[PDB]
Structure formats: structure tokens, C-alpha cells
Amino acid sequence: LRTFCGFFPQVKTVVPASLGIIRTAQE
Amino acid sequence: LGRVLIQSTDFHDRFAYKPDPRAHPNLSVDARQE
Amino acid sequence: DCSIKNLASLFLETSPEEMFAVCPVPLFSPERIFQRINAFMKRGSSVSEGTSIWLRSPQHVCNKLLDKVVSRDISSARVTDEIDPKKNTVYWHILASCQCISASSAFAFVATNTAIEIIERHIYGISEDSLLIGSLPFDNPTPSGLFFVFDRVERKARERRKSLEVLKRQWAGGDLDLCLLPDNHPFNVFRLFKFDRMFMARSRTEASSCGCQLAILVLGDEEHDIEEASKLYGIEIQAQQVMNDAIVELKRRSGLQAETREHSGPFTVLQVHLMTAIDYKGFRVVVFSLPATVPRLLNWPQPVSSQLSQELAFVEQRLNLASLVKPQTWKGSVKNDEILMKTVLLSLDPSDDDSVVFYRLCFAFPQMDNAKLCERIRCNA
Amino acid sequence: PVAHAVWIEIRKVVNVPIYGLTFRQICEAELSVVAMWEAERACAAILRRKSRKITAVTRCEVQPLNISAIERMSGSEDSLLSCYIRGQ
Amino acid sequence: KSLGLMYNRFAGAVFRDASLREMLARAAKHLFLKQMEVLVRKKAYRKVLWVELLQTTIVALFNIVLGTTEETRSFWQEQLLPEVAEIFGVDLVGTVTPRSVCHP
Amino acid sequence: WLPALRRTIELPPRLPLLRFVTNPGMIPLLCQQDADLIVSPSPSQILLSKFIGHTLVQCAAPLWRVWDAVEKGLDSDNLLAAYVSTKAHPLIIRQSNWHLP
């Protein structure tokens, strides 16, 4: 139990900023 | 051992506090109610 | 009798009297407990056929009596109309903890019995047969046990050795054989300095077939003087008392948790280590408890989910400190120079590793200074 | 009638003087008794057939040896050993 | 990384201490990575156990950034604030004494 | 000669019965009449804490192994043996706690 405490992974994936879902909401 | 050791004996100067020397002692132990 | 004999009545309105009317004030005599602590001996499991030694040794016995103290606890204990034994009554538990401290004190009487005969038979006895007067030429032999006179004096000397044999018998064990344990034994984990002397002491009497008290006599280590080597054992004894206080809480809380939760492996691998320092004539002759097998140093890099790492984290968070034992790797052999500056994990057992003891905790509290290693900050501080 | 079995029911070993063997290894092995109609004469192969090997399941007791001697001589891999090997 | 220019131009208080809080959060991020550089250089993962070594460095950093003791005021004025000046480009060493943004 | 004694286990002050010694209110004594007309530590609570306090430290006495025959004392030939020379008798250890009295 005392081996996972604290740290959590920060993930920064590659959602493309040109898809139709993002483009509709941004515009 | 809580009680009093004593030497039953079968001009002593006081002021030297010391048991009297004697060969073949007769030691016994009685509590100090007796 | 001379016992409590079923502690009953006690209804909170009885009297200031009737307390001193049905009780002694040795509530348990020191004969009733010792005639049922020899039950904690012959009733025990894992005795194979007849061969026990480590099980009956006072190192192990006082631990299992501690495992009986922690069992059925205080909050559900009941007094008064509980005349039936073998239940969770306070009369059972006051009987049980009195077995625990009688096991520690019986180790202590054998401790001071073994203590005097080390320093007299091997050190202060070769120069005690004669040489009262130093104006006469004082020629005392060196102690090799460590590595015609007038008729009146002769007959009173025969009276002396005969009468001192009565001292050595009865109250003490009826004489005891010795072993010298040369300077290559793997019991040197019990030892701190290279110029210390080991002495096994059996019973050489009917006993309870236990015997096995080894002692270490402090003498120094070259630039470390004899007062230095003695005092470091002294701070070691005064330090193991405090970890013994943290560890009896580990027995208590882990026992309470494992009982109440699972009433719906081992008990604890951090067992209590019993010692006694002496300070007789000019030396300290501190006595340990003898293991059946060799002590082996445990490597502290350990599994996270293992028992030894898990409940050491509880002992640690009670002591309000940080990591006591440093990361150590133990392939084999010793060095005997540059005495070990770190606390270690002795693992005294023939069976699986379900009973360990602590040692060298004197090198866990810092050297303090402002540099001599006897001057330390106090363990309770 | 005639014979076609024996169901040997070993209960517990007592003082096997296991020699050259790290005390630890002894209680970290797989103590197992293997039956064999003499003739076989310890035919290695037989000592593997999962029909003659009753392995232990308890914890073995690597006690010392006589004591008051090997205790002063140290080392002495010799160790009286036992285990409640319970099985037919 | 150009938040230092915003700290000088912010007039109001809620925007000033929010940018100040962000720079000090990134500061203790950088000093944790700097100490992590030391623990990967000195090859300590072979001797001391790894994850609890990570945990004891984290609780040492939080006790030394957030604190009501003198080791906190000495650690800020000597290590944290000078490192703010090199990565965010503003010399705020001497005016942001730790009882200004000590809030959780 | 007096041999001293400095041990690791005198009387470990985390035993579950030493809670009864420190605060004698939680001893599980029931009552027949009304409980609130009793002082909150009753005399049976306080006195039983005193007996349970003697018994643990009497066990902590290192002489308690032969304590029944300490009271009866040494007879004649044992007293001569202690009288011969200044040797540590196994009945006189140096007191270094003052806990029994």
C-alpha cells in the first residue's frame, strides 16, 4: 500500500485543434 | 533482607562502630519486632 | 492458597473495608505464577517430540507471554459475577500480565546469578586466594581464563570454600560450567568491540532444561578505553527500554486489530529483546539471551508488502523519528575493525523469519557532541 | 486375499540429521518422503512420480544438534530436523 | 514563462497574488526537479528504496515552503526567490516575505 | 558487595492493565444501587488500582523469583556464608529504583 502514494501522472495528449468538434465550438 | 542480622553471644569503646571479632560466630536473623 | 481466589463482589458500594478483608497484598504469590508458567513450557505446540531449547529459552517465552497479555482485551473485560474461568475477565488478565513480568524477572535473577561468577571465577579469584597485603610483594597473575602456609589459615580456607559452596548452591543454581567462545564465533553480532569476552553459561543442574545465558565482559578497543566500551553498552540498555515500550504498543494494537476484525502467518515479526547490565566490582558483564541458531543480519532493502517493513512503519511513527536502520547489504563474514556504526536486524529463529530483535540502536541516536561516542542525547528526549 | 496397495500413512519425521545444508535452505526446500517396493532400489526416476512423493506442507524445525558442543563450535550445518508430513 | 512582465503591470490585488502564487508554484516545481537531478546523479536508487525516497523529498519541500518556522523564511529568501528571478525574469527578492502568500 | 541492575524490561508502561493504574475510572465494576450517588472514582476503584499497582512492580522486583523464601530469611549456615567474605550474595542486589516501598 505504501508504494503508490502521492504522485499521479499528468498526461498531455494530442487532440488535434482542427477537428470538426473543436472548430464548431471555437468559432 | 529487611530483617536485622544479629550475633548471639555465648568495656567496649563505643565510638568505633564495629562488630566484635570472634571465631565461630552464631549469626541469626530476626525481624525488629522481637 | 495465598492468591486472590476468584476476584468477585466489588460492586462499587461495598466499603472502604472488605477490600483488606478478602485479598492478600501479595495478591498473587510468587509460587502460584511459577507453578503455572511451567505450564507455559510443557503445554506448548511445535515441540516436535521432546526437543525444545529455543522455545523454552527466556527470549522466546517472555514474548509469548506478551502475546497472551495482548489477547482478549480490556474494553470487553468484565469483573464481578464472572466466576467461570477461561473467559475475558480481569482476574485472568492480571494473572496473565503477572506471568509476563515474572518471565522478565526470572531472566533478571539468572542474570545476576551468572554475572557474579564470571567476574569472580575468571578475574577476581586468582588474586583473591592470597595477596591481601600490597606492602608484601603483590604478584597477581594475568587472567588466563579470558585469554605452604600455617595450619590455622589452611583449615579456615577449607572452611571458606566449603561454606561458599552453600552460597553457590540453593538460591543460586547448583554450580555451572563455562565456555570461552573464541574470537571467530558468529555470535559477534552480539559483540560491539574486538576486545570483549564471551561466556556461555549452562545450568549444570536439574533446571527446566533451559540454561543458555551468554554474557559479554567489556574491556575496551585500543583507543576506545574500557570506560568507553562499558558506557556504550549502558546507553544501549537504556535505549532498548524505549523501543521495548514502542514495541509493546505494536503487540497491543496489531493484536487488537487482528482479533476484533477477524473474529467475524505469525503475530508480529518485531519481538522484544531482553537484556540486563550489572556493574559489579570493576566491570559490566551484560548478559543476553542465547539463540538456538546463528544470528544472521537482515538486509533492509525489503518488499514493501512484507511484514517486517510494514509494522516497522508503525513503530517508527510512534517514536517520532525517521528511518532507524540504514540500507545495508550483508553478503558474509565480518571485518572486526571500524566497529559497526549502524543499527542492524538480528533475526533469531530456527524457523521462518517470524521473530526478529533489534540491536546497535545506540548508533541511531546521534553522537551529540558540540567527539567522544559515549556522550549522547538521551533516548527518551 | 492378495495384495495390491499399502497406503503408507507417514505422520511426522523427528530428528533427520540433515548435514551439509544452510539451515535456511533446509527449511526453504521441499522435504518429501518417497515409498518404493524395495526392488526398485532408489531408481531416481521413481523419486519423482507424483504417486510416491508425499511432500511436506508445515514448517520444518531446523533445531541445533545435541547443543553444549556445536553451539560453542559454531558453524555445524548439521541440524536435527522434523515436519508433520501428513498424508497417505 | 513570460508571467514576470504581467506581475509588474498588474494593478489590482487579486490578479497580483494569483500571478505571484503561480510563479512560486512553478518555483517549487523547479527546485523539486533540481533536487531530483541530485538524486539521479548520486546513484542512490541502488541503495535507498525508491518511492519512499520520492515521498520524503516531497514532504521536505512542502514543509520548507509552507511553514511557520525560521527555516521557511531562510529557504525562501535564499533559494526560492532567487530562482524566481532567473526563470520568470523579475527581481522580487526582498518584498514578498513569506506571510504574504502563505495561504493554502 | 552490591551488584547493580539495569535492565531493558523493568515494567513496560504500555501494558493494557496500566491504563487501569493511571486512570482508575474504567475498571468494569457494575453497581447494584444508583450509580450517580457514588464518587466518580469509587473507593473500590481506587483501592483496586493500588493492589493492581503493587502486583506489577512486585513482579518487576528482580528478587521475586525466590520472594517467598526472602521473607522467611536465611538460616544459620547461610548467614555464616554471607559472613565469611565480601561476596555478592544472590539475595542482596543493589536497589536502584525505589519502586517497591
Nearest to C236 by CA among C212, C251, C216: C216
Residue D56 contacts residue D12 (beta carbons within 8 Å): no
Residue C248 contacts residue F12 (beta carbons within 8 Å): yes
Helix (H) or strand (E) holding C107: helix C90-121
Q: HSE (CB half, 13 Å, CA atoms) of C189?
A: 23
| Cell numbers 600490597: residue | C134
Distance CA(C355)–CA(C274), nearest Å, equals 13
Nearest to E54 by CA among C302, A6, C325, C314: A6
Distance CA(C124)–CA(C143), nearest Å, equals 9
In order of C112, C237, C346, C356, F25, the CA distances from F9 in angstroms are 15, 10, 19, 17, 27
- Of D61, D67, D71, nearest to C351 by CB-CB distance is D61
Helix residue ranges, H only, chain D: 23-26, 70-73
> Resolution of the coordinates in A?
3.5
Distance CA(C243)–CA(C364), nearest Å, equals 12
Distance CA(C297)–CA(C166), nearest Å, equals 43
What one-character DSSP code corresponds to residue C205? S
Q: Which residues of C341-351 are buried (b: 16+ CB within 10 A; e: fewer)?
A: eebbbbbbbbb
CA D74 to chain centroid = 24
Output phi, psi for F33, to 5 deg. -85, -165
β-partners of residue C213 are C201
Q: List the single best residue of F74, F85, F89, F91 to mutate versus B (max B Cβ within 10 A).
A: F74
Residue C291 contacts residue C214 (beta carbons within 8 Å): no
CA C225 to chain centroid = 26
| Cell numbers 516501598: residue | F101
Residue D61 contacts residue C190 (beta carbons within 8 Å): no
3-state DSSP percent of chain C in helix, strand and coil, to 5: 30, 5, 60
Question: In this structure, how many other beta carbons lie within 10 angstroms of the beta carbon of residue A15?
Answer: 9
Residue C72 contacts residue F26 (beta carbons within 8 Å): no
Sign of the CA dihedral with F30 first, then F36, F38, and F42 last: positive
**E:17-76 residues touching chain C, CB 8 A cutoff:** 47-49, 51, 56
Residues 6+ apart with CB under 8 A from C380: C242
F74 — contact with chain B (CB < 8 Å)? yes
Nearest to C105 by CA among F60, F16, E75, B15: F60
Q: Which long-range contacts (CB under 8 A, 24 or more apart) does A11-18 make?
A: none
- On the 0-12 / 13-18 / 19+ scale of CB atoms within 10 A, A10 is exposed
Q: Which bin fits D42, alpha (ψ -120 to 50), beta or left (φ > 0)?
A: left
Nearest to C357 by CA among C318, C315, C328: C315
Shortest Cα distance, chain C CAs vs residue D42, angstroms = 28
**A:1-27 residues touching chain E, CB 8 A cutoff:** 2-7
Residue C97 contacts residue C37 (beta carbons within 8 Å): no
Residues 6+ apart with CB under 8 A from C351: C46, D27, D59, D61, D62
Shortest Cα distance, chain C CAs vs residue A9, angstroms = 21
β-partners of residue B7 are B27
Distance CA(C144)–CA(C195), nearest Å, equals 15
Q: Which residue of B has its CA nearest to F63?
A: B1
Residues 6+ apart with CB under 8 A from C99: C33, C36, C37, C40, C65, C68
Amino acid making up residue A3: T
DSSP string, chain F: -----EES-S--TT-TTHHHHH-TT-S----SS-GGGS-SS-HHHHHHHHHHHHHHHHHH-GGGGGHHHHHH---HHHHHHHHHSS---TT-PPP-S----
Q: HSE (CB half, 13 Å, CA atoms) of C309?
A: 15
Residue C306 contacts residue C257 (beta carbons within 8 Å): no
Q: Which residues of C243-259 are buried (b: 16+ CB within 10 A; e: fewer)?
A: bbbbbbebbbbbbbeee
> What does the angle CA C152 – CA C155 – CA C156 come to, to the nearest 5 degrees?
85
Distance CA(C234)–CA(C277), nearest Å, equals 7
Residue C45 contacts residue C64 (beta carbons within 8 Å): no
Shortest Cα distance, chain A CAs vs residue E51, angstroms = 6
In order of D48, D49, F36, F69, the CA distances from D44 in angstroms are 8, 10, 82, 65
* Per-residue cell: F1: 558487595
Shortest Cα distance, chain F CAs vs residue C122, angstroms = 15
Residue C298 contacts residue D27 (beta carbons within 8 Å): no
Helix (H) or strand (E) holding D34: strand D32-34
Residue C191 contacts residue C184 (beta carbons within 8 Å): no
Instruction: Give the SS3 label for residue C221.
Output: strand
Residue D52 contacts residue D83 (beta carbons within 8 Å): no
Distance CA(E84)–CA(C45), nearest Å, equals 67
Q: Which residues of C76-111 are buried (b: 16+ CB within 10 A; e: fewer)?
A: ebebbebeeeeeebbbbbbbbbbbbbbbbbbbbbbb
Q: List the single best residue of C323, C325, C328, C342 to mutate versus E (max E Cβ within 10 A).
A: C323
Residues 6+ apart with CB under 8 A from C357: C59, C271, C272, C273, C346, C347, C348
Distance CA(C57)–CA(C40), nearest Å, equals 11
Q: Which long-range contacts (CB under 8 A, 24 or more apart) does F66-73 make?
A: F66/C30, F66/C109, F66/C171, F66/F91, F67/C26, F67/C30, F68/C29, F68/C30, F68/C31, F69/C171, F70/B1, F70/B2, F71/B2, F73/B1, F73/B3, F73/B29
What one-character DSSP code corresponds to residue C222? T
Amino acid making up residue D61: E
Nearest to C291 by CA among C177, C200, C179: C200
Number of H helices, E strands in chain C: 7, 6
Quote the crossing angle between the two packed helices C226-260 and C58-70, to the nearest 10°.
40
Residue D82 contacts residue D14 (beta carbons within 8 Å): yes
- Of E48, E51, E56, nearest to C327 by CB-CB distance is E48
Q: List the single best residue of C9, C13, C75 to mutate versus F (max F Cβ within 10 A).
A: C13
CA C176 to chain centroid = 19
β-partners of residue C174 are none
Amino acid making up residue C338: E
Distance CA(C271)–CA(C59), nearest Å, equals 9
Nearest to C288 by CA among C180, C229, C201, C351: C201
Residues 6+ apart with CB under 8 A from C145: C121, C122, C123, C126, C180
Distance CA(C34)–CA(D15), nearest Å, equals 31
Residues 6+ apart with CB under 8 A from D9: D87, D88
Neighbours of chain D (3+ CB pairs under 8 A): C
Question: In this structure, how many other beta carbons lie within 10 angstroms of the beta carbon of residue B30?
Answer: 12
Distance CA(D81)–CA(C292), nearest Å, equals 13
Residue C328 contacts residue C299 (beta carbons within 8 Å): yes
* Per-residue cell: B12: 567496649
HEC sequence for chain E:
CCCHHHHHHCCCHHHHHHHHHHHHHHHHHHHHHHHHHHHHHCCCCCCCCHHHHHHHHHHHHHHHHCCCCHHHHHHHHHHHHHHHHHHCCCCCCCCCCCCCCCCC
Interchain proximity A3–E51, CB inside 8 Å: yes
- Beta-strand ranges (E) seen in chain C are 178-179, 196-201, 213-218, 276-277, 344-346, 357-359
Interchain proximity A6–E58, CB inside 8 Å: yes
In order of A17, C368, E3, E26, E101, the CA distances from E19 in angstroms are 27, 45, 7, 11, 11
In order of C19, C99, D78, E92, the CA distances from C1 in angstroms are 18, 17, 48, 83
Instruction: Give the SS3 label for residue C213.
Output: strand
Q: Which residues of E touch C304 (CB under 8 A)?
A: 49, 51
Nearest to F65 by CA among C237, C29, C272: C29
DSSP string, B1-34: --SEEEE------SSS--PPP-SS--EEEE-TT-
DSSP string, C278-334: ---SS----B----SS---PPPS---TTSHHHHTHHHHHHHHT----SPP----S--
First vs last C-alpha separation in chain C: 45
Residue D19 contacts residue D77 (beta carbons within 8 Å): yes
Nearest to C275 by CA among C216, C317, C223, C319: C216
Distance CA(D23)–CA(C294), nearest Å, equals 9
Residue C362 contacts residue C235 (beta carbons within 8 Å): yes
Q: Which bin fits C2, alpha (ψ -120 to 50), beta or left (φ > 0)?
A: left
Output phi, psi for C217, to 5 deg. -105, 125
Output phi, psi for E61, to 5 deg. -70, -40
Nearest to C197 by CA among C222, C218, C178: C218
* Per-residue cell: C53: 531449547
The last residues before gaps in chain C (C-N over 2.5 Å) are 147, 264, 370
Q: Sort strands C178-179 and B27-30 into parallel, antiparallel or unpaired.
A: unpaired
- Of F70, F76, F92, nearest to B27 by CB-CB distance is F76
Residue C176 contacts residue C201 (beta carbons within 8 Å): yes
Distance CA(C360)–CA(C308), nearest Å, equals 18
Distance CA(C120)–CA(D46), nearest Å, equals 63
Query: Do chain E and B touch: 3 or more Cβ pairs under 8 angstroms?
Result: no
> What does the angle CA F67 – CA F89 – CA C138 come to, to the nearest 5 degrees?
170
Output phi, psi for C358, to 5 deg. -100, 150
Amino acid making up residue D86: R
Quote the crossing angle between the two packed helices C312-319 and C226-260, to the nearest 10°.
110
Residue F63 contacts residue C111 (beta carbons within 8 Å): no
Q: List the single best residue of A1, A7, A8, A10 to mutate versus E (max E Cβ within 10 A).
A: A7
Query: Do chain A and D touch: 3 or more Cβ pairs under 8 angstroms?
Result: no
β-partners of residue D83 are D13
Distance CA(C125)–CA(C128), nearest Å, equals 5
| Cell numbers 526537479: residue | E33
Question: In this structure, how many other beta carbons lie within 10 angstroms of the beta carbon of residue C190?
Answer: 22
